[PDB]
Symmetry: D3
């Protein structure tokens, strides 16, 4: 398909998955991370750079026809680290894209943007943010920044609020939040194939019977996830303690992130 | 089941399909069009007449237990043609029905009633009209008139906003708008079998993954389309040039109709 | 405010009021009607013609900087008459405007576009039309046509759904529908001063305690009606017979129009 | 799932089904009814008593881990009888639950809480009640009371507005209201397994093509009905007389209950 | 105007006010209460009776052209008292009205029907009930019953959810809930004068700046309260201790009723 | 009232106004800014500190019972400066408050959080953000951060999206966006007096006839602005050129901010 697809955060959990899974989407896959990467194989380029380094980011993006942006701080951490990877880093990514043809972006946002909602409430894409920590707040920043770039310059971005992207559901919450590898891959393919995308909020979950999120307004994209966490309900009962009804795990959409304090360095 | 079903526009694309598919629905199928009709077979009656001719429309409707109204100007044309076929014609149709037992009507409205909406916007049945030309405006007229006859006299009509009712999806837009022959046929069956219909807006599309329209409020009818344009995405990608993101074809729900000028004779 | 303002339907009830009240809005007031006009005074031009005649409408509009479109059939009548003044006439008006610099239009639409709603239901501008006769259907046509010209060519129109524009309220329904001369004049002023108008639905009523309609989304125009029909309640109670609860007058927003039959020539 | 499950109304139509179908859900099934119960088998306890008698209800509930509350007056009857089983009985049940560890409750509410809505209107869980008789009003009382106990004490209840829970659909209305035994059993299972339930309104219907009700906001429970009344349409069409369009059966969601008078003792 | 107006609860706080204020509304005022009533003056009739006594309620209502129903248990009490006065009592009232020409009813419902909502949430008339006790639940019963009689028989009722109808606002909550005597009186006048009423929910509050409730949909009645609790903020600040932010008084719309236990005799 | 009120940005435009206007609200007014302040008068303390300096911010806040946070970058600027004053600075402010009793905060947010909405659209507090530059994005950051602190720790904040806080409206946009000094002062007083605030979005505008924003859901606060920009419409026509309809000034709620590029250092 496209000539060069950039995957940031390529040394991380989802990154290593996409390095393999997204290979067929582009002639060249460019992997990037602040961490060392397994050496480039055929049809790969590998880049080491800090998202906080504007010039390095510019060079990282130059020549790419698309970006799957997975790089950054992925859990609650002290402000200083989140500022670097998720705030400053987002600005640098969007400036870099703006300078190099505005390649379409799949932004790994997070359920933690809305982590304080009760699990009993079904959410559409326009609900007000209720971030469950500094991490969630920084993902909101990425979303607001992407939106401004879309309105101002036409830069297109899929704001994918990922639930739990794992090999399989492994706790009660994931019966709702699970986002299979296959379904995330198919979403990415649907996002790049669209003639027109805009800057939509996308709920990153598989077709789970217990899902909390409404993607119906994204119908124009033609993406229907195929996996269903519900198949794993018995597996969960036979491999974990039953949740305590007072556990954040079953009370808040962000689960135990709500229990995180403000971490300090 | 019913004694006599009138199909107008019977010489056109859809009319020819329905002349065949709807036969099982009535002892007699009365076919009508302004254009020459293939001669009547057994259990058929053929009438060639102009919808703008009130007396002719009266005789066309007399003795009919139902009407599938496909007849009229079907594309953007100069005002006078549309006035005759779609405005005067609709008034004549409704008066004729009113004088002859108010046979239930399936009205072929159009997506062009809402053609100026962006394709990214999901639409429910109550959205304000945004017609994309004189043709669209005239289909709005049909919907408004039918509603008035419903409220005033109890005349029942299904206002079917047809997307693209063709043998197969042919382009990117039809991945959203396609309305299979089978699904239109089952809709008509569902409309006529209903003890109570009212005057509902019905979105005329199959169960397409990329559909833009929400038919959920029509649930009482018990009609669920079974076809899905998504099955053709690959095929369309393989046999047609990728749309330009600036083409009305992938920007507006009415596709290229928004680009139509006002046509003059 | 402007060089020349066209007032159509200038011989009619509202026309005669606006001929006097709108004089200060332009250097020249052009008055037009199908019927004879009192002779042009200083600062006036008068033209007698039929909206159904394109050449005449073209001349009527040429050189005008704005149009207050009051001309047309104003009550339920046979379809033939409505077709001329309200359907053909509207097409002609919009084509003439399009050929002559797209002067901003105040369109006299009508409450009868929604006449079948119960009086107990409060309506915002986006409710589905429920016209109470051919007249109401024809005003819907005007709205649909104007919206199409706005979306296609940028022609701006205020779709004013007039309640009862009279010297004073004189029945129970008018405690809700009354639209004072002063408040209609001020709306017209606010419509023409606006740098940007669009094609908004506007509910044409004064600030009546018993009003049925919500103009809040029109706030950007900065128009606040100042009269209030409520002040006339006692007068009406003493001057008129109490309404029968089964009377259309107190059951439908369109009042007795719902009781109109289809009139024939 | 639990040590002891109480099933009230166990002698009635649904009671007899649940006595068999819910056995696997608990070590001990306690069956209760005003009327005589078939003798307790292994793993059963049986208690015959009136919900109107607090001491008896206290004993009935004590030691139970969950309650499926089917007991009460199930059709329109004189107020006196409804008062006992459905009003006084409900207060007693909730007080007994409050005194005995607040075992989770599945409440058999009813479609008759909203029986006066037209069949053409799709309903979400928050619609205002429109009860079609004293019976419907009494089920509303149950819902209101349960909600109060939830907000005040945390007592959790599933307010199941049952459509028509029968072996199969046997009339036109049931194509929309049918609630299969299997789907009710699976709902009960999903209600009791949930770590958190709250006090949700639940529409009690299978996955019928012609369904009137929207359970989407209940998604967090992970319950998806699997049966579909639509499969019985032909059978019903051939086995029963076509409904008269003026019949309450096809006009109101409560069907013929709207035609019930107020019955007197 | 009307021949005879029944006021129940006439011995209570509000009843005493209305015995005086409503006199001008009818030739005869029939006052009723279970408690001793001051003896009847000219143009008065006094009846001392229990609402739970069906025969008594029948005679109380017979010959009355309207009813202001203030009678019943007015605070949280044990179930039996509320059952008699507010549940059995309401059934009796509605049956009595049904047997005697369906005199229009002003029903004193209560804010306690929705007492568990946060004070920060603005409420429209269709919000789901959240009663804060047995008293609240019983007022819900009244609303549900009245609605059923409306739908089934056409009996009209104003369901007035009274906030705090007192001579003046006394505390912080009353800055939002206050309903002046004058405004309640004008509401009642507006209710009875209306040709068509229906069975509307009415929020019983004056035009308070800090009001929580939206009466806009009641516009057709033409009732606009004129008093405003805000005028008393200073005074309340000056003469009462500032509320603790944790007090139900400033946390829940039902104020301290949420803190009520279930009272036993 | 309170002992010590902090006003940040006290050397700026609004700061100098509030230094004077808010004096009566507290025994001690503490003014802070990165810029030099006019020396402390009686009942004033003056502090010089960079919002980016965590320790200085801690000391700035310690001992204050309330904060009006006006300090930060107030217009579109390069990222580096906005990062310091509006992002890092916001984190430091919220940490400082959290360490010192969580004094209630009035946050100067901005209309520029929603600057890309058309002026024709009326906005409620829950609309999705559409920031019109880096500045707007940073105000969104402050809002999301404040919300997280509220959900996590109970920190209360008024998120005041200020329109144009000036001595008087001085262009066409300000007929909609004007926020008088008096009305901002009264809002601040209303915010601090509330027993319960939460973390509400507040639209910072006076009671302008041409206002675009809906504060109705904030009714519980009891704040009604008293000034009206509409009084200044003639003043505006007589002191400025009429707006060009294509000017951002009359097309976007953020006015010419939409025209700002990304500024670089
Ligand atoms: N795993 C899940 O199910 C969910 C993941 N997400 C997110 O999607 C993405 C991938 O998540 P994971 O793979 O699980 O996290 P990870 O922590 O396994 O991947 C993150 C990568 O980004 C890199 N990175 C961090 N700071 C950087 C910087 N300043 N410059 C350059 N690279 C930097 C890391 O070295 C790393 O390999 C993240 O942005 C994350 O927030 C959101 C919701 C759920
Ligand atoms: N095929 C599609 O995808 C869509 C179809 N529709 C519509 O449903 C109907 C059928 O569509 P098509 O078969 O594709 O169009 P067609 O142009 O192939 O069928 C229309 C027929 O009506 C006849 N007709 C035109 N003016 C007449 C008059 N004054 N009096 C009597 N008959 C007259 C024509 O001769 C013709 O055969 C139309 O009313 C049309 O607007 C609306 C949206 C999409
Ligand atoms: N008066 C009211 O309260 C309300 C008025 N309206 C409307 O606003 C307008 C003015 O209403 P009125 O003054 O009461 O009606 P009118 O019947 O007193 O004024 C209408 C005028 O248009 C003229 N006209 C009719 N057909 C024409 C044609 N084919 N070509 C050129 N002129 C033609 C008539 O000769 C006439 O003087 C109308 O469009 C009407 O429908 C809508 C709602 C309420
Ligand atoms: N069967 C259906 O499709 C629907 C059923 N429901 C309801 O679910 C429940 C079961 O319905 P069915 O089995 O069809 O009714 P049923 O009339 O066959 O079962 C009700 C049982 O409760 C008992 N009962 C009545 N008053 C009592 C009292 N004062 N104390 C103790 N027990 C008392 C009866 O003796 C009886 O066996 C009821 O609450 C009913 O209202 C609601 C909607 C539809
Ligand atoms: N005053 C307020 O702010 C609010 C008042 N309301 C209500 O409006 C009405 C009047 O309220 P108040 O005057 O403050 O209460 P009240 O307790 O001063 O008036 C109620 C009257 O009904 C009578 N009553 C009680 N049980 C009866 C029975 N079984 N049969 C016949 N009469 C019976 C009482 O003796 C009494 O005088 C009530 O129905 C009440 O619930 C609701 C919300 C607020
Ligand atoms: N003036 C208006 O009508 C509107 C104002 N606002 C806002 O409300 C506030 C006040 O606005 P103005 O008075 O007009 O702006 P200003 O630019 O006149 O006031 C801002 C002050 O904050 C200070 N500041 C900047 N960076 C700082 C830092 N790193 N550490 C400590 N102090 C720093 C400045 O030195 C300055 O005096 C701002 O936060 C602004 O964004 C929002 C919408 C409209
Ligand atoms: O909610 C989750 O499952 C996850 O969401 C997050 O955004 C994380 O990156 C991740 O590791 C998880 O904690
Ligand atoms: O959207 C469509 O495919 C169609 O719209 C219309 O309503 C037509 O009848 C048709 O021929 C098409 O161009
Ligand atoms: O509703 C009304 O009062 C009026 O509305 C209409 O549109 C008319 O033009 C008029 O004369 C009235 O009948
Ligand atoms: O609506 C139904 O089919 C049923 O609903 C009811 O609530 C009954 O219990 C029942 O027997 C039926 O009449
Ligand atoms: O909220 C109120 O002020 C009242 O609520 C109620 O409905 C009462 O009748 C009353 O006495 C109050 O406590
Ligand atoms: O929109 C405005 O008027 C203002 O809004 C802003 O947020 C600014 O601080 C200010 O100076 C203005 O440009």
């Amino acid at each position: 398909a496209m000539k060069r697809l950039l995957v940031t955060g390529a040394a991380g959990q989802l990154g290593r998955v996409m390095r393999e899974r997204l290979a067929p989407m582009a002639e060249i896959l460019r992997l990037a991370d602040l961490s060392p990467l397994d050496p480039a194989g055929p049809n790969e380029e590998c880049v080491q750079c800090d998202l906080a380094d504007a010039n390095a980011v510019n060079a990282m993006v130059a020549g790419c026809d698309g970006i799957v942006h997975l790089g950054g701080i992925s859990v609650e951490k002290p402000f200083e680290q989140i500022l670097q990877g998720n705030i400053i880093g987002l600005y640098n990514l969007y400036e870099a894209a703006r300078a190099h043809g505005q390649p379409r972006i799949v932004f790994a946002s997070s359920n933690h943007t809305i982590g304080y909602y009760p699990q009993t409430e079904r959410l559409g894409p326009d609900v007000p943010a209720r971030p469950d920590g500094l991490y969630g707040v920084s993902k909101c920043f990425g979303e607001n920044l992407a939106r401004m770039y879309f309105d101002k310059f036409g830069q297109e971005t899929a704001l994918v609020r990922i639930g739990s992207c794992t090999p399989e559901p492994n706790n009660y919450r994931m019966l709702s939040t699970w986002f299979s590898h296959d379904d995330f891959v198919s979403l990415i393919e649907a996002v790049f194939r669209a003639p027109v995308l805009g800057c939509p909020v996308v709920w990153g979950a598989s077709a789970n019977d217990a899902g909390w999120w409404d993607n119906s307004h994204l119908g124009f994209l033609g993406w229907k996830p195929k996996d269903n966490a519900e198949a794993f309900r018995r597996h969960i009962t036979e491999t974990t303690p039953p949740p305590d009804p007072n556990d954040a795990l079953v009370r808040f959409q962000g689960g135990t992130f709500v229990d995180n304090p403000i971490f300090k360095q």
